[model samples]
Target: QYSPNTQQGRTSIVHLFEWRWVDIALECERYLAPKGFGGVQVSPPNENVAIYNPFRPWWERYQPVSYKLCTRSGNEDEFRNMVTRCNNVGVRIYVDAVINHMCGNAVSAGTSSTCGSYFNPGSRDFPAVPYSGWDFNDGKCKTGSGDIENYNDATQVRDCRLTGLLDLALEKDYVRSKIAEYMNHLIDIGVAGFRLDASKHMWPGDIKAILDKLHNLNSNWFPAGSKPFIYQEVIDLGGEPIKSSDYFGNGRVTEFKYGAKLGTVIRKWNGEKMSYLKNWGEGWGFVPSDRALVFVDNHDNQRGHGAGGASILTFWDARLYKMAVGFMLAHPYGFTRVMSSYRWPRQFQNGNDVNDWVGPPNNNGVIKEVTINPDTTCGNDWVCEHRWRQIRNMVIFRNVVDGQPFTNWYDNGSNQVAFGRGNRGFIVFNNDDWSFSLTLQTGLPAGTYCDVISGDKINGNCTGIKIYVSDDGKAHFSISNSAEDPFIAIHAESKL
Candidate 1:
């Protein structure tokens, strides 16, 4: 469960948030596989309640109505085709599995489901999964509100409804089997793994029971006896009673602290500096590097849904966003999941976005097709950060320096820092308010290397900045604080 199951040398997964299966398939063939990306983390594929009043918000996907592989993204046939095509080219797919609960208790019963499944939340009846009231946690919950009123009470948080969503009775064999059946269906369809949604609201043992029932990877494409990669979404900061370490036995836990702390440092908030990142991973109190899924920002926290705080970086902060992502990728901290988001008109008032609930780019109700622009960027308001030049090149940087050690560290004792991944890669950052020019040891052999962050090395020449490493393995770097991208990176693959 801890293994990402990617082919040799690939090292990072990009979360193509809200992307359709067709577009993902095209991405795998045309961009991701060629760029050395490990895999793609797709949005929830299961059928979900359609919230018409909110005009089909994105959160509706979290409100499951059935286990059917149907959503605005695509149907089963399209899903299977995308899966097969992606796997054919060494790009794995990990689905976001929402098994913690069903539709909200207050939602009216109707056929307004993505798959047209009839689920009556009023009576707790879902005919598609054949789930009835007994499958719910109403009998086990000790809360008077039937909802998780306080996160301090771990029992109530697990058993009670999450914001009125009907909690599932995961302890029962019947409920566990149903969830497992849905996951098994996905596994048999050849998915690489799952991102367990709302894992903080479920007990670790309860999740392990379901994982135990899941079948191995589809042997036609994967090795025999290979288990699905399971990474649970558990958000635990310092004060939370439910710790991220509790779920380490089942699989890797999404390291929420990774982003929260990184953001604080990158923004130079709270007196934190880039120099301290010399000991980035386990040194900063994160989970073991092997049992963590890391990202700068996610679909939830980017929009102020899950982890609260305005400090989290997003595409809106393109300059710092690239720098943070580049640092994360270059650092070799944990299993990275890059965030690719679509544009939404963000209107803020009193520290809240009035339109934060808007769905992806769509016409009327149907999701608009992702239009690939001529310049390799995306149209239809899709901010394909994974396609951006700076971030895209860093993905390859991480892959090239996958197993290298963190060595030859240098910093200005403040917001300026530089480090090398053994002799395979090196990076420099300038977050100070003045010019940064220094002769630094690159730890690479004598050669002219292309800085991937600035631009690509095509043919026999570089399109952007170039660094000449002398016989002493030293190169000089210069960056102005006022520059658009205050960082530069170079790796073995870009050496000319």
Candidate 2:
């Protein structure tokens, strides 16, 4: 459950939220494999209710109708083919398994014969998977409205319904076996791992039991005896009774606070506060690096669904978002995950007029096929952040500096900072209104290296800014505040 089961030298995962299986396979061969992405966190593949009242919003995928590998993503055969094609290219697939609950109360009875009334919330009736009233936590809810209203109560959080969704009784042996069967089927089909959705709402012991019954990864892609890489979504913002540490025994927990804190610090990086990033990991109240799955922003938070509020960085905030991601990949923190999103259709509740409920770019309601341009960027409405030169190049940089420690730290009393990853990589950032020049310890061997941020090292020349490192590992670094690129990064592999 701990190992991500990635190919050697790869270290980061990119969440292709709401991407189709066919598109994912194409992405693996065309872009991800060449870019060195560790794996992809795909959307839920199980059959979900076809919600149309709000015109088929994105959250409809979160509501499961059955464990069958049939959803808006694709059919069973398409999913199997996708896994095989992606694995053949050395890119793994991590599924988003929604095992916490079934459909919520948003769909009223008698609303539509095909769409609504599939799952009766009042009677706990679901015929697709045939989950009856006894299979759910009917009498276990302690909240006044039978929904989770107080996060401070652990029992209510685990036993009550979240947002009117019917909570499953995972403690039952029959339920555990059913969930394990679904997961083992995926493992047999060649999936590498999963992102357990709403794990905070389930008891750790129950989840552990289900995982215990699961099979190992398929021999087609993983080594023998390799367990599925599991990372549960337990959003703990410190005041809640359900902390992420409770699920440590099961697998890694998502570190939501990491992004919230980073976003806050990056916006205030004008010198004194930016220097505070010197101690980022444990000092900022995040879980240990090994037990935490970190990211800049996810589908929910980026649209203001979960924690972090509007402070969370996303593709919309291009400059600062890149800087935040730069710091994430540059530093040796938690297991990193990058977000690749699409342009929203409308405004969200934050009043940005960014429609939070808009589904992926589609014709009417059917999702459109993702098209990749000759330049490696995506067309249609997808915001392929992972394809950005700065982002993809950093993926390579992270792989190059694997297992290295931070060294040669420097900050210019205000919104500028620089650091080195042992002697393998060096990076500088200027967030102030004025550019500054200084001789800093680069920690790299004497050579000329290209700044990967602005450009790349072609054949034998640097197309971007160049830095000359002396024999003593010190270099004269200069960054302009007025320049479009506010950072300069030189890595060992970028040397000419």
Candidate 3:
């Protein structure tokens, strides 16, 4: 739905986790636009309760006090400027919308933040939004203690509290209208879409009503009649009380099953890797491509925040992680969102609150500005994996092969995988710990191609292994773990 980049045939979203609005605006012009990125799914922009427990924990942002755009990321002025600037540069902004709840029953000293306000959840007082206890959903909650204790009961999950946070009652017309107005405000500022947090806790009918009320994208940046794209976060593991289909009518739903399938393939369990390519799509119970948001890892799953499922792919297994992402990007499946994360004690820890501002090397004394590490490696507990050459190049590769389906599938009975991307590009993944060679179908014109996996575009020329495609679309190839990375990629326009 982000026409800025989508009109050009690119399809990939990068979660620029915990970046400030100013930095995001700068990045859109300097990097994302030139790299053909679709959009950036940014962290929640609204001001939230400043929690002191767990040392100003990340989840505090999830417990928002108001819809005012004054978070650690930036103020209202900067956020509006960022949206306009990014949209101008052919990159869109997707906000992480934490709409399910408000600040929890936590303690807060009388201190006003950038929003020029204070909040006390215990008193049911939020001066920012001026919300009182009546705004919360107390009628539908069935629990005596008021937490999501019963998944089988839809009302319990929808109206009950999530992690002791204040649950907003979507059934009320006033609440729906207010939420819609908040979203429309962002839409008017040129944001393309939203990533609804804890969507499983909201009723689909209520969510649909809110989506229906959203205004079209601002005509200044988006095409006329373009709907604001929405992707909801519904953590549905098989046999779980909630399924993704419940929210499919409202918007695309997150496919939690992909992570487990990828993990199985990488682990080489009973030739499970082969099963991935053979039995793709509905065979694995994934929603259709148009209805799914696919990711290898997300904010919750990486650190085992009750979402530690096998289907997820994280940075822990570097080799397998690359293979999983590479395969995901190459294959034509659901809409892909590349996870940008940081190292932390737990997966749910938001990077911005995790001492990322003041760390070794930079030692910048201000938390207002994000100090980028001079080295490519991420510092201050953040793991900027999206910046890795392999991953970024694959994003470009996916853009080049957009809408082109996979063909000429060829996989050895063992732990090797290879496939062609619509005959425009070829990729191979070697999972075996040893070297292997084979004469395989190139599905490319007769010429020399540079390997993208090892190190692409060295001094303006690819400096990796060379594959010689004969006139008959056949090439002799070999792969080993000796290379810096264990994957080989070549495109038609690649230079050697």
Candidate 4:
């Protein structure tokens, strides 16, 4: 389950948040596969409450209505086609599985589900999935409110409703079987794996039971008997009784602390500086690198809702965001997942975006198609941060430098730092107030290399800054504090 199951030589996955299945299929063939992306983390594909009151908020996807393979993205056929097309091009697909709960109990009863399924949350009746009061945890909850009110008590945190969403009785054999049946359908449709959403709200033993019932990957594309990659979402920021380690035996856990701390350090908040990243992974009180899925900002956190509220960097901070993403891609850390988001009308009242609940770009209720611009960016409210020159090039850099040791570390004892991955790749960062000018040992062989952040290495030549390495495998770097990128990166693949 720890394995991502991406094709060899690919290193990163892009969360194409709320992207349509049709667009994802085209992206696999036209952009992601050609750019060497390992996979695409799609939004929840199962049926969900349409949520008209909030006008289709993004969180509605987190409140699953049924296991039906239909959503705002598309229907079952389109999903299957997307998986097939992406897998054919060596790009895997991972579904955002929402199995912890159903829609909010207070939601009006109707056939307003994304897939047009019949469901009534009032009596805990969902005809589509055929789940009744027997399928939920209402009786098992002990809190006076019958909802999670104390995070310190792990029992309530797992057994009670999360913000009024109906908690599932995953301990029941029938419930596990139904959830597994739904996942097996995705497996048969050729998905690489799943991003188990809201895993912290479910017990580890219940999750294990569901996973044990899952089938192996479809043999047409994957090797026979190959297990699906499993990465659970359990936000562990410490001071809480529930730790990420408790779910380690099932699969990788989302390293929430990775982004929270990195954001603080990058923004230089709390007196944390970039130079301290000399020991970035396990040394920084985070989960082990192998069992962690890391990112600078995810969909929930970027909208001023989740962790790292003040410190998280998004595409809004163009210069710093690129540098942070470049650093993460270059560093040998946990499995990386780059976030691709859409632009929303961010209006602040009392230091919060009132429109944070606005869903993806939509016309009335249907989602708009992703139109690609001439410069390879998305039109109609989409922010394809993954297509940005700096981030995309760094994604390729990670692939080229894969399996290399982290060596040749050099820092100015402040924010100026330079490091290399064996002889395959090197990167330099200058977050100091002054310009950075130094000749650092790169540990790479003597060659002419192109700085990937500034531009691309074209046919036999560089379109950006070219560094000539000396016989001693050392190269000089110059970067002014006012420069836009404030960083330079080069890898073996960019060498002439």
Candidate 5:
């Protein structure tokens, strides 16, 4: 199933991590719809434990308490209204469903009834959802203390607690029905799909069963006979017991391994060393293209949660991040999602450090305002990488080249990279510290083309920069990290 209710020929989705529903609706109308973005993967909208200990950390949303549609993002009405509004603008909304587990520990402060309960780990109480000791899988856990201790055993991973979080036994029909009903409720309210968090800790068959009971997308928002896309978060590194292939029959699986592979290539980008892209998709360890949800970095990995040791490229490495994201969106890979994040200074630190340090501070010390500079770089603490000129322009290129396969390819031994998208579009990247030029094979007919990554041209004339492909599909291009923009993209459409 696909998350984006994309009209014919549309391509990418963007994860608006931790944004409010009201703000999201505004963004969809103002920016996303016109930019050709397909959809948004929103923060968890369910009621949850109000843990102030971590100072309103992002993961706090992961510890769901009930299906009330009330959290820091918004309440029930706001969430529903957001889905309808975004769908009206051709931007679908995918919810982050946290069904694998609930809060593990209990804290004594900031528990609002409207939002839910205050839990006490020492007391084993969560009155909000009314989940008691009997509701958890304590009896099924193989560990001595009834906790998940072994990753090698499939049963323990599925039935035991994850980091002490309360695990629901989906083997029970009632539990499966309950989860399905919650998802169906969102579907009825007009959401397009879901990001199944912690899917690696659950049985794939159980998820398959729940998906079976899900309602089709509401006809008002979706085309008739459309199924809501379901992407499961199965983090399968090679040799891991939880191979992503196991869940392919049910829905798309997050391709975490690709993120690591791309990160490695960016750090060591020799042009001749670009053989990895040729061997991408099923040829590598990844699932088939249709069953993969490819992204450079996701909410968990980018924040250093879930599994560590993944060499990731966040907003901190500005230039390299552009190249990596551009390459991902340009290549013919699986369903792609661009990441739009609120900038944090330390990408590897724990999520609770909300204290302000170097830039403008919010009431809680975290940077609240993410201002954009005329040059397209973000000011203040927030890193709006998705809004960068190169990244945004690539979104257009990706949409224009939606279904094309990789064709003409060229590399300059160590620093330059170039590729064509099935005669639909072409892109070039320069990662060297110094400038270089090359006559590239564009795989397109002779014509003047707009360099999307640079900026759009005006009144049929090339603007700040443009690319001219000769009748033989050859064009000269040059770039460097020192340039105002380090990449160039030529596509079939002006607005994608």
Candidate 6:
């Protein structure tokens, strides 16, 4: 379950949140494949409620109405075309599967007019899948309001409604079969796997049961008995009753603490400090690399919905965010996932503002077509941070150094660090206020390598910064605190 089934050298996935299927197909061919991304974790492709009051907020997609491959993203045919085209280009598709619950009472009667599925939250009714009151968890919920009120209570966390959303009775054989049928249908259509949404709200045994019923990946794209790649959304921050380990046997769990800690260390917030990252993996209280899915931020956390809290970094903090991502990709850790988001236009004076609810660029509640520029960047309010040189080049660096172990570690005992990935790659960072200059062992054969963070190795020339290594593998690495980029990275493939 930990194996991502990525192409031979690729090592990372990107969450292309809210992108249309047709647009994703184009991107897979033109950008993702060439850039060496493993796959894309697309928004929920299933039918969902349409909220007119908030004018089509992004969360509406999380409240699924049915398993039909029809949503604001695109129709069924477009989704199939996307999966086929992307897989042809060596990129995979992972759907955001919302199986823990259905729509909340906020969904109106005619909200799902376009994609018709009868769901009456008032009576625990959903006729599309023919689920009725018995299909939901009524007696299991111990909370007074039937909503999850205590993270410390495992039973309430697992069985109760999450923010008033109807919790499904996943333990029932009928419900498990229905969920499996939906996932199996997606698998038949060539999707590589799924990002199980609200997975923490469901029991691990129930999830494993559903996964057990899923069919193998499509033969045309995957091996004979390839199990679907699953990464559950489990936000465990130590004191919580449920830990991410409970779900490790089934699949990888999202390590929400990673981003929060990385953000603090990068920003030097709350007197937090980091150096030499030598003890970065399991020592940092994160899940083992094999059973964890790490990211700087995801669709929910970036908008303050999920676990990481406000301390989590986003594209809004471009400089520090890039450094954080660079550090994540350069180091050998959990399976990495990057985020590509659209700009949030609305801002409110109050704390609970509508800013986070803003949907993708839309035309009167209808999603607008994505616009890609000639330079491979996205416009039309898309942030496209994954396309940045620092981030994309690191993806290449990660692919080049896959399977290599860390070596030749060096640190200033304060806010500067440097390390090498065997003899394949080397990276350095200066987080202090002063310039850094030192003769460090880079663990590479003597050569001039391109610093991928500042620029690229283009047409056999270094387009940004270059570093010269001695025959003995030692280099005088230096970086100014005030430089445009505070870090430098190089790999054997980037040799000039």
The alpha-carbon root-mean-square deviation between model 3 and the true structure, to one decimal in Å, is 3.7
Question: Which scores higher on lDDT, 3 or 6?
Answer: 6
What's the count of clashing pairs in each model shown? 0, 10, 7, 0, 3, 0
lDDT of 1 at 58: 93
How far out, in Å, is residue 479 in model 4?
0.6
lDDT of 6 at 438: 88
Candidate 5 stretches with Cα past 4 Å from truth are 105-114, 118-127, 269-272, 308-310, 347-381, 494-496
Quote the positional error of residue 3 for candidate 5 in Å. 6.3
Provide the lDDT at 303 for model 5: 60
What is candidate 2's TM-score against the reference? 0.96
Candidate 1 vs 3: which has more lDDT:
1
Residue lDDT tens for model 3, 167-216: 88887788888788888899898888899899999999989888889998
- Model 1 clashing residue pairs (backbone): none
- The residue-level lDDT of candidate 5 at 40 comes to 91
lDDT for model 2, on a 0 to 1 scale?
Answer: 0.87
lDDT digits (tens) for residues 229-310 of candidate 5: 8899988887667788888877888988888778877777344244446556677767788888988887776766664244
| Angstrom error at residue 34, model 2 | 1.3
TM-score per prediction, in order, is 0.99, 0.96, 0.91, 0.99, 0.90, 0.98
**Predicted candidate 6 versus true structure: per-residue lDDT over 240-348, tens digit per residue:** 7788899988999999889989988888987766583679889988898899899999888888787777788999898889889999999898899999999987465
Model 3: CA > 4 A from native: 1-7, 106-116, 269-271, 345-381, 458-460
Model 5 per-residue lDDT at 423: 84
Clashing pairs in 3: 259-311, 259-312, 260-310, 260-311, 303-347, 342-382, 342-383
Root-mean-square deviation (CA) per prediction: 0.8, 2.0, 3.7, 0.8, 3.5, 1.3
lDDT string, candidate 4, 79-146, tens digits: 99999999999999998998999999998888888978888899999988879999999999999998
RMSD in Å for model 5: 3.5
Cα lDDT tens digits for candidate 2, 212-262: 999999986788899999999999999877889999999999999999988
